[PDB]
Structure 1
Amino acid sequence: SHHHHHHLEVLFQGPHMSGVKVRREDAKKVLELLKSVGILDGKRKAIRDEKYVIFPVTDTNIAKSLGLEVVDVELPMRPERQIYKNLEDLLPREIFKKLGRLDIVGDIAIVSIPDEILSEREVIVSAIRKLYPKVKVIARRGFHLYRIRELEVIWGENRLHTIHKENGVLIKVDLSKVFFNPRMKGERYRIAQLVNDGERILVPFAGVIPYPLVIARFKNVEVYAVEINEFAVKLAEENLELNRDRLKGKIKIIHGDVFEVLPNLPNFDRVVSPTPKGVDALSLTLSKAEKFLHYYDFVHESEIERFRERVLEECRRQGKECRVSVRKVSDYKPHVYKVCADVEILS
Structure 2
Amino acid sequence: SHHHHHHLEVLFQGPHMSGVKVRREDAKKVLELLKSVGILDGKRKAIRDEKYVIFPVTDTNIAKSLGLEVVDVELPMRPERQIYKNLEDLLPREIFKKLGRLDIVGDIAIVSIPDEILSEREVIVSAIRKLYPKVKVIARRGFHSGLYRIRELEVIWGENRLHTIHKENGVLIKVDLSKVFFNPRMKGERYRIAQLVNDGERILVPFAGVIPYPLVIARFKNVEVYAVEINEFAVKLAEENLELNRDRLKGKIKIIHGDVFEVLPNLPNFDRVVSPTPKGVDALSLTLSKAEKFLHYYDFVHESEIERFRERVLEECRRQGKECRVSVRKVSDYKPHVYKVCADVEILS
* TM, length-normalised to structure 2: 0.99
Is the partner of 1:179 in helix, strand or coil? coil
Match in the other structure for 2:61: 61
Where in structure 2 are the equivalents of 1:1-347 lying within 5 Å? 1-144=1-144, 145-347=147-349
SS at match of 1:343: strand
1:280-303 Cα deviation digits (max 9, x unpaired): 000000000000000000000000
Give, in angstroms, the shift of residue 181 of structure 1. Answer: 1.2
Match of 1:303, SS state, is helix
- Which ranges in structure 1 are unaligned for 5 or more consecutive residues? none
Cα distance between partner residues in 1 of 2:75 and 2:343: 57
Q: Deviations over 1:150-197 (max 9, x none)?
A: 000000000000000000000000000111111100000000000000
Structure 1 Cα separation of the partners of residues 177 and 132 of structure 2: 19
- Which whole-Å deviations, capped at 9, do the CAs of 1:12-53 have from their partners, x for residues lacking one? 000000000000000000000000000000000000000000
The separation in 1 between residues aligned to 2:183 and 2:226, in whole angstroms, is 20
Deviation sequence 1:101-140 (CA, Å, 0-9, x none):
0000000000000000000000000000000000000000
Q: CA deviation at 1:218?
A: 0.1
Distance in 2 between the 1:131 and 1:298 partners? 31
TM norm structure 1: 1.00
Residues 73-104 of structure 1 deviation map (CA, whole Å, 9 limit, x = unaligned): 00000000000100000000000000000000
Quote the Cα distance in structure 1 between the aligned partners of 2:67 and 2:224.
Answer: 74
Q: Residue 310 of structure 1: CA displacement?
A: 0.1
Percent of residue pairs identical: 100
Residue 302 of structure 1: SS of its match in structure 2? Answer: helix
Structure 1 stretches of 4+ moved >4 Å? none
For the residues of structure 1 that align with 2:116 and 2:81, how far apart are their CA atoms? 33
User: Using the alignment, how far apart are the partners of 2:3 and 2:243 within structure 1?
Assistant: 69
How far, CA to CA, are the matches of 1:224 and 1:299 in structure 2? Answer: 27
Aligned length: 347
Q: What is the distance in 2 between the residues matched to 1:46 and 1:343?
A: 58
Q: Secondary structure at the match of 2:16?
A: coil
List alignment gaps of at least 5 residues for structure 2: none
How far apart are the structure 1 equivalents of 2:30 and 2:226? 60
Describe the SS at the equivalent of 2:191.
helix
2:331 match: secondary structure: strand
User: Aligned equivalents of 2:3 and 2:236: distance in 1?
Assistant: 69
Question: Once the 2 structures are TM-superposed, how far is the Cα of residue 59 of structure 1 from its aligned partner?
Answer: 0.1
Aligned-pair CA distance for 1:63: 0.1
